[PDB]
């Protein structure tokens, strides 16, 4: 639902690169392959962590809050 | 593309499929 904090296989921290990855795709006009390498994700265990992630949090945030303060 | 009468390839068939599901969907028979 949200970007994992650590790579499942080797434990590298990948939860602080989601926004950078999206920025590279949008503003830098880079393909997903080049963006992953620029972020320092070399082992393919880490690449699939960011490459195949589905951000379902955005869909959930569209619903109005159940309890508003 | 270049000519409006050139034959299509097998890759262009997926565009037709995409149009089909945009109009019908996956549960068209139930609703229809």
């Amino acid at each position: 639902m949200i970007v994992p904090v650590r790579c499942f296989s080797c434990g590298k921290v990948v939860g602080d690169k989601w926004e950078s990855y999206l920025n590279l795709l949008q503003e830098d006009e880079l393909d997903e392959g080049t963006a992953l390498s620029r972020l320092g994700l070399k082992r393919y265990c880490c690449r699939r962590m960011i490459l195949t992630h589905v951000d379902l949090i955005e869909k959930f945030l569209r619903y109005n809050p159940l309890e508003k303060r | 593309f270049e000519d409006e009468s050139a034959p299509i390839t097998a890759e262009d068939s997926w565009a037709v499929i995409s149009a089909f599901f945009r109009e019908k969907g996956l549960v068209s028979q139930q609703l229809d």
Binding site: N64, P65, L66, E67, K68 | -
Partner: protein, 45 residues
């Protein structure tokens, strides 16, 4: 005592055993029990 929340207008209500189950503001008939105010412990594993 108990504070309830409407499921359509998010209005916090207070209902008793005699009060009818319904929102007094918008008229909805679905109410969500409010989150407990007691702290809950969780393990980060």
């Amino acid at each position: 005592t108990l504070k309830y929340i409407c499921a359509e207008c998010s209005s916090k209500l207070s209902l008793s055993r005699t009060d009818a189950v319904r929102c007094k503001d918008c008229g909805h008939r679905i109410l969500l029990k409010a989150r407990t105010k007691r702290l809950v412990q969780f393990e980060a594993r």
